[PDB]
Amino acid sequence: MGDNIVLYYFDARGKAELIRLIFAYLGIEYTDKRFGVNGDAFVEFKNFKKEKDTPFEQVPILQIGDLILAQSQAIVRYLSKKYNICGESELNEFYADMIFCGVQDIHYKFNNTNLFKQNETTFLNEDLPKWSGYFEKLLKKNHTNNNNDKYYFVGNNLTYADLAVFNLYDDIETKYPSSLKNFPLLKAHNEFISNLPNIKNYITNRKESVY
Amino acid sequence: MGDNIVLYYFDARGKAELIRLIFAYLGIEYTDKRFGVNGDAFVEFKNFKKEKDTPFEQVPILQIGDLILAQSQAIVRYLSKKYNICGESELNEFYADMIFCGVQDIHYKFNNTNLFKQNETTFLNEDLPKWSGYFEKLLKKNHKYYFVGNNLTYADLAVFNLYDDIETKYPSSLKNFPLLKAHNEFISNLPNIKNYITNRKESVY
Ligand SMILES: CCCCCCSC[C@H](NC(=O)CC[C@H]([NH3+])C(=O)O)C(=O)NCC(=O)O
Ligand SMILES: CCCCCCSC[C@H](NC(=O)CC[C@H]([NH3+])C(=O)O)C(=O)NCC(=O)O
Ligand SMILES: OC[C@H](O)[C@@H](O)CO
């Protein structure tokens, strides 16, 4: 009967936000369990590992019925196939995958700066402008003569890749609000994703986070 | 008949080895292009990016006919679906995927020690034993040793590759994990793999 859905993570966006964005977009009901809200995060996490048989002792963990799912990326791809926001072709699914992997390379770099105190200068002057150019270009290839007011990285429909790129820049802007000034398509794309009803309803009612 | 397959990367195993292992296992023909083997890796790489329109200016890059494919993990997943070495059921494909990302987590830590010379003891005493235990435990649950289903999946190759790369520096690693060891021994003896390895030229990373 579909069973109960529970997402386990710390009281942060981090590696669980994209999963939350997918649920919001699909309008899926689930319990957003966050360590630290009702109790001490450290103690909640330790107890959690004793109660649940996780494969790698890491979160996020997605529980569907009695099913325990680990590794955010795998969970994301699994949810995308099941709710069809993966791409109408094996080839378009590859492209969405490739872009998601790209989001990973640049996001990892942002994390090293915004969280682990790594030189922000290299990020702001070499990594951010460069990777933004890559996405702008990929967006340029699949637009204008493919879509109008709507912007998608793959095909003519929303894929988790659009959600991943939106999440990436939504996060980068909580630190550098002016990042997309020189990237029109990328800027219009994120504005577009942010205004989808289900997404808009989740963002505006989402609690602010540290990361 | 079909389209020429060309794999571009540096003269190393690194992020292209799993793909090469998949091609070997499948018995698929392709040109293994390696920067530096003939010309100068630096120069070849520079010329490469001018000749091919790559999405992120990084390699590996798999070229199939006119198609340009980037990002090693996306490539591995694409090839596995196209050649049916992915989890067959939706849930099994998820398990193969989850295990593969688990391999990336620990492979990432090996790279920081093996290549960017980070702390070698942290990896050896805290990371490696712990992760080998996770893999050993995943084998137990689903138990010819296979992580998912009763057939070979790219996850099996990913695990094999991980420990094969780790062993180039720490040989007696998985001595205390029988299942995991039998599993890698098993994969290494598959005719197509066994043959590919003995003919494979050694290299740092
Ligand atoms: C320096 C790394 C900072 C980690 C940022 C917070 S995320 C929480 C952390 N989880 C992961 O790193 C999961 C990685 C995994 N690849 C995924 O994407 O799901 C965890 O459970 N960690 C358990 C632990 O550390 O014991
Ligand atoms: C950090 C040095 C370690 C060397 C390892 C060799 S990997 C070569 C490197 N490629 C990547 O990092 C690709 C990452 C990508 N996420 C993938 O998995 O395909 C590249 O082309 N780099 C070109 C560049 O950065 O300009
Ligand atoms: O309530 C959410 C449903 O799963 C919908 O996305 C498809 O019917």
Side-chain angles (χ1 to χ4, degrees), chain A residues 128-173:
Chain A
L128 191 49
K130 189 168 61 178
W131 281 78
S132 295
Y134 298 154
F135 297 124
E136 184 75 12
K137 181 179 176 182
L138 284 159
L139 204 51
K140 202 178 205 303
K141 289 156 59 182
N142 196 245
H143 193 60
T144 301
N145 286 295
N146 304 66
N147 295 293
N148 183 63
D149 215 6
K150 302 186 283 187
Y151 306 77
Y152 314 95
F153 276 88
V154 179
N156 310 295
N157 292 79
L158 188 304
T159 60
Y160 66 94
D162 288 301
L163 262 20
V165 170
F166 163 77
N167 181 55
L168 165 66
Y169 283 90
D170 179 61
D171 192 34
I172 287 172
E173 291 174 354

Side-chain angles (χ1 to χ4, degrees), chain A residues 25-29 83:
Chain A
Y25 178 74
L26 297 170
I28 293 181
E29 300 283 55
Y83 294 104

Side-chain angles (χ1 to χ4, degrees), chain B residues 12 18 31 37 44 67 79-80 88-89 99 138 140 148 153:
Chain B
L18 178 48
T31 298
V37 69
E44 288 198 295
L67 283 181
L79 295 180
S80 86
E88 296 179 68
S89 67
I99 293 174
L138 283 173
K140 299 166 187 171
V148 180
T153 66

Side-chain angles (χ1 to χ4, degrees), chain A residues 16 58 161 164 200:
Chain A
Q58 307 168 306
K200 183 184 186 184

